[model samples]
Target: PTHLSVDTKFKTEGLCVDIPGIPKDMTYRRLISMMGFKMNYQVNGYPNMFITREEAIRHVRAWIGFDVEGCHGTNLPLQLGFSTGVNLVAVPTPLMYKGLPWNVVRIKIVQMLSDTLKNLSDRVVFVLWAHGFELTSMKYFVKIGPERTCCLCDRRATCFSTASDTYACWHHSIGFDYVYNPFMIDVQQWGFTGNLQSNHDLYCQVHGNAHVASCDAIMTRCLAVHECFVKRVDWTIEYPIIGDELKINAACRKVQHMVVKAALLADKFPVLHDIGNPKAIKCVPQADVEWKFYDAQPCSDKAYKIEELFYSYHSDKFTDGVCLFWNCNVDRYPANSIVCRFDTRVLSNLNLPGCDGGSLYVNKHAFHTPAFDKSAFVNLKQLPFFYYSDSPCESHGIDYVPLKSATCITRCNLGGAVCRHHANEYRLYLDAYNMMISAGFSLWVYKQFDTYNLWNTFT
Candidate 1:
């Protein structure tokens, strides 16, 4: 009221759209009608036969059942493969390793990653480089609003500006990849390299050409509503789509978060370089304290880089690499070829797993990390979560290290029984791992694997 204009008096922000057809009116008939998917149709006096909302749900449910190997999320399916923390606090869906079958699981993940690999670009090239991270996480782990529910909110999403004149979303500025059937990661924020968006409709014949960015479009709408960062604390929430009564979408969320983390990590160096150096990386707030999947912190003021790298995996695709699919190419050789983009010739030559003919590469889990106690899995023939770190941890390949007192789980590697578990940790490393999957394919199993040999990963 003083001497300010209306523009200066109030602020503008993102809209609160739920997932696709999330509103009460968002019927199965309406949802399918929104895009490429078609259903048996014929109008009776009741305007029926269009795959009732009940039936459409089963359609998705059936797809989920088939994909789960047993896969399983927080945030939009978008964040499924993105969060990673070496410390106990923010580990992605590590249990994905335990829950699903090994072979089928690998193939499922490769399908998604392999699908995106051939079209990798500098923008999303990180997805290719972070293959290990994405795979591990997918190997690890959506939304609703069928109305009185939640929608895709970008309160604190790490969204950058995009430049896609393609076919932007109704509410947001992004466009759909008719070819890939997802939103492409193209933006004009942070003085980026200015490339990454590409035509993604070449091979779109598989999923049928899409007209919109799919549900992801709404997930990002929260960010699109606002050009700058909007912390969850001071953020708005609403999903563009609705209907998760089945929890079908929640299937591989854990895996997605981890995969998302790994994908982000590949671009960690670049993100840190571009996003400003704030301070220490802060740990996650612990929204999952008693919730499904779970935290770690003490990050640089800006852990953008760190945040991207440490996390979990599963069918669950899109959780990693922050955002991508912008440079999709139907002509992408491997996506359409038997060899695939994960050329084993290059990967295997470097000791990494790659396709050896029709054969696939297996991680075989062969490494050690302070992030979890190897001793936790006593039945696995290991000493039990007790390398007994009498002195501090002293290992070469120890990945994710939590901020804590220096001691092993049960016994120090150099000294006697250390009996040191993470501080204030609600559960031991294996505790969470065990809860997620059986001991055979637990988090410990990952610690001891090759972290290589992703079969059929590459040609």
Candidate 2:
């Protein structure tokens, strides 16, 4: 034991002076610096270049507010103690070593040392991690426009304006697309399928130019179903009882079936193009066909022949971006008269009719007409068809009535206020007095002026 025993006891007071190979300058400098500053002074003093071990410990303790007594049982180590006259060297051992970047290691070492010192003092010091970009950049602010009110209810707003703000109210915000409203149309389900006969087959057949292969199949299917329904006289048992309802239902069913079939067919032929030559496709005029008489009689005798040739032009050619027009004359018939007068034009988009300019018209007679007759053809009974037209100079300006103008004329009778067959046109009030006069009849046909009745029906 005396020959090979290791020295376990080390003198604490002489440790600094007796340490082997310890530099005199370093020890003197450290001791002098420690003795020069008072404990309280060291704790409160601002950090600078030269700092003693005691001062550093005091500053760290004061800043951190550590529990030194709880961490170390006896007195807290005044100086990091060392063994006297003993060489402390670390030898490499056989083990796997993972390489670390100098910067990362340096940061990690500093953090670990700080954490160890804090643990010894029984204190927690948080270091927040923040991105420079996040700290310096301003918060994004998004400001939306004000809430929009219904134009129909308030009678103060417009369709475009309402659409720009809140999308509500048919009068103010109805789009060019056909939207089947439960309140308006009876049919519930609606959609477009690309597979349908060409416009040439459906519309151009009347003009002797039906040879075009690529036509609007949806419209053709619609016409086919229409023909099918018209061919049948009595499809229901209660023919006379619910005859009108049955007829409407049957016609609607036919349309629904055709539309559904077209949609189904669309799966096979996904991209059905428009008829090659639109001009070749013929359109019939309402006036030439005796629409009212046809409606009065049964479908058997009332098979409407597509005779009057007509064609709709692109409304956008006239106006830049304004699709709405006012006070413009629309052609009641096109091919019949080559004069090119104004009328509403319903173009096709996504296999559906699009309401362009001249698509909306207010019937001049709607304002003075009587209540609509349920038995009669509402479209024919209403005179002065209000159809859409694109005349920017004449109709598209601000002075021309805006789309919301319909709310003002809602007081007119149903027969009096006739909307265009194509939904995109203006709401026309057929002037009863004017219509009667035009038909060579007297104003007395209306009996007495009923503003209340007019207002009720119009609204």
Candidate 3:
């Protein structure tokens, strides 16, 4: 959860202490040694806050030189992946600057906390809601443009020139929606978020009648979220091939799905509907039909259409002298011979893919060769193609149409070069870190900057 802006919050209720630690670039591990807690692995002095709490007691005693008493407020629900409740730390707020000398230790802990909030605000979008819909779609659409990005809004049709490629207004400037705010709000409402109250609207500023929310709300939001705004990229993200695949075959394949579904089902029988001439199911009365139907058709013309659109049809431009998988089953489709109905994978003991990769059977034989000319042929290269993207979790187009690169992160171990853009994250940076730190302020405000990491992990 993204907490309130530390600089903003401290200015109100608490003192802002920004100082460097001895090691300069130290993880939470180092903080445990200096400003030892008062509670024994008891978050903010509340031992009941956690179980396996004793381990944390000894784990720190080995480093802190004595038993610690405080446990900082933690959002236990997020830790447990539950949403029903928020586990407030319940302990008294850290007393900073009220009593002096003895409180310096307490002041140090508060400073450390503000330090964490400042760093988190550095990347507000990812911190607060990486999974939020607005930020998620905005990240890709702004990166890939409307052509290849989400269809949530028309990004390209509005852009007439290269100058308009970037968003004219980052929020609420869409053509259709006309006012779409991209940065989702302060929804840390569910979890404790280390803050008692999160006023998302505090940042909103109501401009004209067009903008219902206040500008102060927007400004306040941008105060922290603005830091997360990525700088300009000369190019967009999605690289949907355009110059070459204009071939008729690709076009045909693109349109294949549309026609295939209709052509395949034009003859399939809806079983009972075709039971003996079944007449043109006219608009019948409640008594005329007895509604002898289980689902009670929503329409009298229900007999005219097959809503599901069947599959597994073999298109053979042959004589209708014969028809064929019914003997295996009990159902007879004699009167409704117009269609045949529904029906198989075992990579038994297959653990992982080899160099050539694990095998799959596509059954990619021709629709059917005539009895006159029988020949076996299949293009394994173009066989189903699996409808999968380089990023296994996503596909840009409706059904396996390529265009998710440059936006989706790459799995360094799996996908190829096009999707392998975020591989730098996997590389350890122990050497490159210390160079960025010199001033005392940086020591307290260093950013973790990872796509994935806990806001704080206390063992």
Candidate 4:
């Protein structure tokens, strides 16, 4: 005659309890099976794109293509870009490199990047065109070191070289393996001819825009996908493998290791100061002697109130931001001025507005011709209209969204013809440079090239 309340009766502490309409043997797994489990795997649509489901999941699902653009002359990176073809992410390195405050900002950026990068899925594979420059760039950015922070081996060896070599030997660990991961693919080692810049016009015909970090990242992803997915190139057997016999410049490797060690240690510093706001940098002088073809006339008050240092406006005259008619004559201006013409029929299909519907000649001096090549015009059979933004000469910002399903198969220059035979050698050369700091070789080296050493020694 024990009164069993619904809530109290259900909260039985014993292993087994008699319950109404429920089997005594029903466990969590059994119940889940009876209810029918929902796998809910991400429907990225790669299943249909690849030849088989297995191949699709194995190859493309966890893939990411990354590219780093350094400052014009120095080794320091200006921007880092990566993409999965579907989504793109770009991170700018600290804009300033001088003084203590700027140095702190750089450290903050590094720490932020490290956290975000480390949080990515364990199975994620980074695809770079060439690892040489990126390895060095990452070395500097991540602050990889010879002593103290060697995250490469099981023994946690003090020597960076020994640690890197040990890791490289048994380097099966996922993302944390700093020395090298078998999953990381350098597309340049694929032995394809022609660099992306050389084939930029051809690819821009298929993909939208050019000379961008995210765009370039997506292009690298496309190239890798095209090779591995479409061309069925195997990374293990097909890729050139590195061996221990490959001797390289010890000094270069030492410097690179120091740089990487510096990058890795940046996150440990306490963020005590504000980095400040992004300032609007002008592309051209305020008093330029001309009118803009895509002027932001009658722009909404909402648009004017935007806080972005740089912003682009879509004109009411241009339909959908892609098919734009500038409304002018080609021959009215001098030959030096920029003028472009497009087939009105092509524009019509793309939803062109305010068009006479036959042919359109865009105004001279309004558009820059360097943005689009003649090959793009020939391929599209029409003038290419790109979304407006800050001029390429200035750092507008580090972000982009590439056109979906668009890909290019242009090969990047790994090291010309030699890469075909010695791709692994090239990889080792870069690896060796990074391993220098990891091995503690920096201890004996003179103070000329070492940043961390100089800072500590002086202060």
Candidate 5:
């Protein structure tokens, strides 16, 4: 009886009826909860909120637009839609029943999608309609920051000013996370503007849409693109947007590398634990293992003692990501000889042996000086008896002189007499050997002041 009476009373006179016995300001909810009273719902008590014509005519511009859908009554994203003014890309997180913790997978995918969005050119503005819901849903997918609550107590919080207004809002409301674009054109904030607001208006002619997330994303993108075109504001692509495809490919490559390396160690025997301790992993390779080297320069026919310490990653030999060590015996050859010289291409890639791009002394000895003890037997000494320097003749304890001033016209043998008047022919043998290592006394040396014409044979 009371239910019918309350319903009829509200139907006839909404928000105007009052009983004399009830307190004037006692609310209906309080009466119902505290005193076991109930009331029928009434409508038309308040005027519907409407926007002004001025607000409705606002122009919109955007390049990137996106929409997100959440699981029922939850902030976790169930699906995501993005449009880079290109074809709409819809990625739905499959409902994981038995797969366990499908939530984590969704978080990773959403985070990845956010990353791709953030990676877009700084000049590009992101467009989203009513980012409030999208922003809230992102909190479930992206971790929230502690600063989120501080904004509530202090409106002028530092989190309010971020590189991007969208990021500021995101950091203010959802806490600071790494997934956000600097600029965002929230179309919903543009008031009641635009023709594409209704689904049947612009999108109806193209395709019959549904409640699915695909429709929302497409509609949002259509609105952004339409407004941008109408306003003559075209989208720009200053830098390539980092897409999911590139990241996935790189991840795949990394995983494949890990798998292959694991197989290599597995196929082989044990790996030493400590430097000298051999108690780590147990692995060994087959006996007929073929070694591979990536980034190794092609060895010339003259390459001697080409020692390959290890095999490479790819099946191809002497290719990608490889290190190599080899020697081309220049002692047997003469200086200024092209036979032992590196190919220009090879020489360009090879690191020159030096401290500052100039030639290094092999053993800190100068030309005409014995590489090993002169008193030592010749059978015991090594072939490379001469060392070289950027300076002209310092290693032999001779006062240094510029290349141009250090001229020796006559061959001077170690005469039993201490006179500076013999032709310097005997030093030519060791000097020529030094010249070979230096490719004519340092390539940079030639750019220095001129030296004697007698050294031309070595040069």
Candidate 6:
């Protein structure tokens, strides 16, 4: 009688199996039998099971060998869980960009870049460095090129002229600014001059014939290149943050929403009108409010914190009252000054803390005057008090618990898919790139694998 004991160790290299008290030949045969049986069973059950057993066995052996040799297996579950936990639950709501005024859009972009830098780490920095060359080139065109002509426009000179000489001559005389020409412009004179020619050369190499394309075409092409690279790079660089999966999806969704919002805003208020009006609404600095309005002596002399100001601004006091009017009329007002005035009588009689139950004055006319309408005021009064009753932090914190939980699950699933896809893509791309590099730009290389050696050892 023989007793067989199987001990298994899951190692980074691969699974190690130890069997004690068995003859070497018998053990080898038994192991081979088990592996062969499992492979046959799986192959037989597979969708493409019409193939002969010999063929299936051969294919299975080849596949198993390849897998073990490559040391490639799914890390989807672990990565997905990690990213979902980090991003989905932790990431804040992304702010909108489109439909925002040009200045606001610029600031939003800056903020977006800042947030991305903070969250995404050096990736953002690398992207910015890559983006800087284009930005600088565009800036140069904007500053020195013909009126309303841009870098893209200069690139499109070929579209306007069929002859290269005519395009070059036109570019030199009108399109290119002699004052800021890369050849003529010195670092000493300009204080700093980027290697525009080198940047352009790199750009042309990465993207062919952009120089000959129209400005719109150039921009579109560049954006497509950027998107492709970003997608590929993001996929390749695998970093899993717990709970971030949901947040990433949410961020994408928010971006979609922002686009929708921009379209809606554009439809409601034409960009032409908003651009023409150029109303500037300044946020009034929040001040400490005493109980004098409520006919109660101040309890403690604690100064209002910045967080309080934020809370107050979003509170009914601002949202329901004259602050809305002030914000709307920002373009009309002087910088840092409130344009519309609130009725002190209405403000005082609210009989509430922080002016929550009050009327809004839009151009001296209250759009939805609170308290004036008894039913509306009743509904307004029922609204959860932002500052005095429940702290915004507490409310948000409470809301976040459930949101995080739901987002985490969603993010985890999405992240798992993304990570798996990216890992697979990275493997393929890296293989291709390395092959290309090794071949010295030659495309005539035959690739093969050592199947027999791999199978015997692994099996």
Best by lDDT: 4
Candidate 3 lowest-lDDT run of ten: 365-374
Cα deviation of 210 in candidate 1 (Å)?
A: 26
Per-model CA lDDT versus the true structure: 0.21, 0.21, 0.20, 0.30, 0.29, 0.21
Residue 336 lDDT in model 5? Answer: 13
lDDT of 3 by residue, 47-145 (tens): 221112122211111111001112221221111000111111112211112212222232232232223222111111211211222221222122212
lDDT of 4 by residue, 370-443 (tens): 11113222222321111111112222212233222111101212112222212333344445644432321212
Candidate 3 runs further than 4 Å off: 1-126, 129-186, 191-267, 271-459
Report lDDT (Cα) of residue 407, candidate 2. Answer: 25
Off by over 4 Å in 5: 1-64, 75-79, 84-107, 110-126, 142-183, 193-200, 203-208, 231-459
Over the stretch 1-459, how does candidate 5's per-residue lDDT look in tens digits?
211121111111111222224343533244332222222343422111112212122212113355554444242334454442122212223222222143443433334333433332222233556433443333333322222223334321212223334333321333332332222344554444443346224422332345444455556654543343222322231223233333333432332232223222323312211111122121222323333322322221122222332222234232222111111212122111112222121121011111111111111110111011122121121222221112232122122222211323222211122122122222433344443333321111011122232233232
Better of 4 and 6 by lDDT: 4
Decoy 3 TM-score against native: 0.14
Per-candidate TM equals 0.18, 0.17, 0.14, 0.26, 0.25, 0.15
Write the residue-wise lDDT of candidate 2 on 118-145 in tens digits: 2222221211011111111101101112
The number of the candidate with the highest TM-score is 4
Worst 10 residues of 5 by lDDT: 364-373
Better of 2 and 5 by TM-score: 5
Candidate number that wins on lDDT, 2 or 4: 4
- TM for candidate 1 is 0.18
Range of the 10 consecutive residues with the lowest summed lDDT in candidate 2: 180-189
TM-score of 2: 0.17
Write the residue-wise lDDT of candidate 1 on 314-346 in tens digits. 212323212211101111111101100111122
